[PDB]
Amino acid sequence: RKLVHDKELAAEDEQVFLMKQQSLLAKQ
């Protein structure tokens, strides 16, 4: 039952976040 570390911290490349926020600003 030796626990292993779960999913590590992701990067979420800046381009994807920027384009998602482009979309959010567009529809607001």
CB of 1 to another protein, least distance (A): 15
Residue 1 or residue 5: which is nearer to another protein going by CB?
A: 5
Region class of 12: left (phi > 0), else alpha (psi between -120 and 50), else beta: left
23 lies in the binding site for another protein (CB under 8 A): no
d(CA 26, CA 28): 6
CB of 7 to another protein, least distance (A): 10
Note the Cα 22 to chain centre separation in Å: 15
Q: How many residues bind another protein (CB under 8 A)?
A: 16
Q: Which residue has the tokens 């482009």?
A: 22
14 lies in the binding site for another protein (CB under 8 A): yes
